[PDB]
């Protein structure tokens, strides 16, 4: 769900950046309410995420080549030998059905090599399950002697916004998703709107990203009146302030001049102490899934020489307790923890 | 001293506008804890019907299966609940889905080419190019296919665009619509938005008559501040029409001559429906859920 | 891609108002603001939903591996 | 009266890819040192 920015420099159109949207316009409230948002952590609305807000997909392609001059491995299935329920993922040709759900261990293709006289399969292995988007057979680098050995398989990995994923405004204010807060528990505006994204007010005094503050009242003014605003640098002056410009626009529309909104608590239901700073800010979802190195080991495999847990997250590997952690355990005088 | 009969004496309801989709009603002399409770229930706890299990047979469209399945779930169905029983999750799929627990919606669209003189319109250039919510055909099955005879399953908004196609592409699916609550997923929330706003209070401390009264009148929306004459003071005609923009406070001539507050007891609710139930039905069920929640705890053993 | 079903913030159905919006801009020759008002979008959250929609699906569809040329 | 976004213009160009000169010349001007550099390898004066 790509969206055109309300607040934008006119050069955005000059480069036709609308052909490739990089973000989405979100209702962002500068509020400290949940308690889970603080400095490097921001809150995303549950009901917004449920409605497809900031949803993304990731495509991965694999080349299955049979080269390792006489042809031995052939795409498909060998006669007389057939291990149980493989036909569920692959078609008669040995290639997978485009659209099929696959998990690590499932067969991604099938072949038969005469050297071993057995029907073997190339397994799919990744922590993230996928769906087959594209299967292309390529039989090149030959004049008359044609036979397929090379196949390109594209995987579609669906990526919903998860707790840990980074989100940022166009002002360098990045934060990890601390929680997907429910709309009933979310603070609700006088208008009846609950913010899509919650940014903590304690982020701004150190970063000094006032561009985001003027972007908030500009985006709101442009959403109401239905007009895009120019946010090209040095357009405004000390005499002609944007806070006054969009402030006048906000007052004319029927909202507070200083970009504030009377909001009510989602828990108590009572009106909050003061009017909360709410607006429309163009947010970007960063491609990284930070919890990729998430692991747990009780008793897994060990190396023959040291007889110590082997290295490898996916291999049920061990966490290293290095010299510094050794030093720290000596530090506490905690000899049994070291042991 | 507060009695439940003493609450009946002061509690008032005022209906400003009651349309087929949205109702604007007031709850006078009630606590925030009760008004917020109904609000929370109307969004999260009032059960509704939405697609949950989309079974794809073919999808040659540009729109990915996951995305297309998610869009169907988001489409509100003009289906009254209570007609459906709650599905049990522990028993298997063959016992799980029945004529009492599930509603089936099929989508079978194939795109082709049409001969027309050529910018040319997609409805002219191709046949079945745009897939709409109205293309979700209702398929009644089992023991009861006569209960939905005078009540056909049709999406609340039919002109909702579901998919866009080019000749050669096809969509073939069987969607299983079930009963669920808004707390689980936003697709099950029967309300478009159920929110309340406290009655704005404008405490005029000084008479502020004259030309300053005309200046004070422009600080609030047109139908809020009314002036009798040049004198006879400056009164508040309809404090309910106020947007609470605090525009009056950002002027030295009024910053100390007026106070902006609220009526904590008075709530202005605005409930819009997705299309399945009427806004009144959604509010009534919200009060019925809060009562049932307190009733279930009443007739319950207090263990340990 | 296509117009989203329901407004991300409140949940008001917006998917049926995309083709109707372009008709109000083309045939009716109205401004962006007035067109959204006639569709029944008064909250700025519902307003930006359609106003800010790109509709890359029309660009995406021009690549069809099922039809020649 | 404003510095608006092209909505009607955008959607028309999405359906109709121009058959004349491409829109956004600055985008082609961005890759001008790359294409131009390789172009001078065969075309231009002195062969």
């Amino acid at each position: 769900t790509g969206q055109t920015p309300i607040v934008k420099a006119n050069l955005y159109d000059d480069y036709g950046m609308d052909n490739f949207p990089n973000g989405f316009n979100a209702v962002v409230a500068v509020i400290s309410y949940t308690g889970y948002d603080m400095d490097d952590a921001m809150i995303i609305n549950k009901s917004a995420d449920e409605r497809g807000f900031g949803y993304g997909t990731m495509y991965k392609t694999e080349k299955v080549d049979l080269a390792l001059d006489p042809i031995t491995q052939h795409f498909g299935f060998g006669n007389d030998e057939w291990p149980k329920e493989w036909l569920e993922k692959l078609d008669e040709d040995g290639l997978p059905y485009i659209g099929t759900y696959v998990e690590e261990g499932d067969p991604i293709c099938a072949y038969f090599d005469d050297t071993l006289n057995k029907t073997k399969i190339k397994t799919y292995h990744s922590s993230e399950p996928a769906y087959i988007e594209e299967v292309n057979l390529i039989g090149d680098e030959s004049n008359k002697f044609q036979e397929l050995q090379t196949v390109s398989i594209k995987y579609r990995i669906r990526r919903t916004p998860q707790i840990g994923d980074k989100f940022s405004s166009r002002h360098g204010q990045k934060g990890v998703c601390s929680r997907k807060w429910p709309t009933i528990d979310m603070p609700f505006s006088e208008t009846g709107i609950q913010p899509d994204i919650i940014i903590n007010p304690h982020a701004f005094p150190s970063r000094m990203t006032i561009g985001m503050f003027v972007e908030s009242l500009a985006g709101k003014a442009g959403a109401l009146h239905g007009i895009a605003q120019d946010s090209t640098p040095w357009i405004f002056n000390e005499d002609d302030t944007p806070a006054d410009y969009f402030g006048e626009q906000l007052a004319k529309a029927g909202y507070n001049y200083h970009g504030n909104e009377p909001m009510y608590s989602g828990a108590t239901g009572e009106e909050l102490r003061a009017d909360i700073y709410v607006g429309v800010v163009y947010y970007q979802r960063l491609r990284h899934m930070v919890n990729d190195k998430f692991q747990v080991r009780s008793t897994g495999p060990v190396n023959s020489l040291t007889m110590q847990p082997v290295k490898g997250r996916k291999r049920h590997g061990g966490i290293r307790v290095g010299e510094m952690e050794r030093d720290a355990l000596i530090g506490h005088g905690t000899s049994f923890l070291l042991q | 001293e507060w009695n439940v009969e003493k609450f009946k004496k002061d509690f008032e309801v005022n209906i400003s506008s009651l349309d087929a989709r949205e109702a604007n009603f007031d709850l006078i002399n009630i606590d925030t804890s009760i008004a917020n409770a109904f609000r929370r229930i109307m969004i999260s706890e009032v059960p509704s019907v939405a697609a949950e299990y989309v079974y794809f047979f073919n999808n040659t469209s540009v729109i990915q299966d996951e995305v297309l399945a998610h869009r169907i779930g988001l489409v509100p169905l003009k289906v009254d609940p209570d007609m459906l029983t709650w599905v049990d999750s522990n028993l298997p799929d063959d016992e799980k889905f029945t004529d009492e627990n599930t509603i089936v919606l099929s989508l079978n669209v194939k795109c082709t080419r049409n001969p027309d003189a050529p910018s040319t319109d997609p409805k002219e250039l191709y046949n079945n190019a745009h897939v709409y919510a109205r293309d979700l055909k209702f398929e009644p099955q089992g023991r009861q296919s006569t209960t939905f005879a005078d009540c056909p399953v049709v999406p609340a908004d039919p002109d909702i665009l579901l998919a866009k196609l080019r000749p050669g592409q096809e969509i073939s699916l069987k969607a299983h619509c079930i009963l669920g609550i808004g707390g689980d997923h936003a697709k099950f929330s029967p309300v478009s938005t159920a929110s309340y706003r406290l009655l704005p209070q404008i405490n005029i401390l000084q008479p502020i008559k004259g030309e300053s009264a005309r200046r004070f009148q422009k600080c609030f929306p047109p139908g809020v501040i009314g002036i009798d004459e040049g004198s006879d003071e400056a009164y508040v005609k309809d404090a309910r029409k106020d947007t609470v923009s605090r525009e009056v406070l950002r002027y030295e001539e009024f910053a100390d001559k007026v106070k902006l507050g609220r009526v904590r007891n008075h709530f202005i609710f605005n409930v819009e429906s997705a299309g399945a139930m009427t806004p009144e039905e959604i509010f009534f069920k919200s009060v019925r859920i809060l009562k049932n929640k307190a009733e279930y705890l009443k007739n319950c053993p207090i263990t340990q | 891609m296509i117009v989203p079903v329901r407004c991300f913030s409140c949940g008001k159905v917006v998917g049926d108002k995309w083709e109707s919006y372009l008709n109000l801009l083309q045939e009716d020759e109205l401004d962006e603001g007035t067109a959204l008002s006639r569709l029944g979008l008064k909250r700025y959250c519902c307003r930006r939903m359609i106003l800010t929609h790109v509709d890359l699906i029309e660009k995406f569809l021009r690549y069809n591996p099922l039809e020649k040329r | 009266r404003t510095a608006d976004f092209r909505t009607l213009e955008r959607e028309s160009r999405f359906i109709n890819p121009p058959k004349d000169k491409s829109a956004f010349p600055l985008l082609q001007e961005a890759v001008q040192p790359h294409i131009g550099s390789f172009n001078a390898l065969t075309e231009g004066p002195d062969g």
Partner: peptide, 24 residues
């Protein structure tokens, strides 16, 4: 230096919950 041009004919487009654009 020329000031940023203000937008032509800006009207009220936000009112109370159960109140429309009836007031002119």
């Amino acid at each position: 230096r020329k000031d940023v041009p203000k937008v032509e004919g800006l009207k009220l487009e936000h009112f109370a919950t159960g109140y429309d654009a009836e007031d002119f």
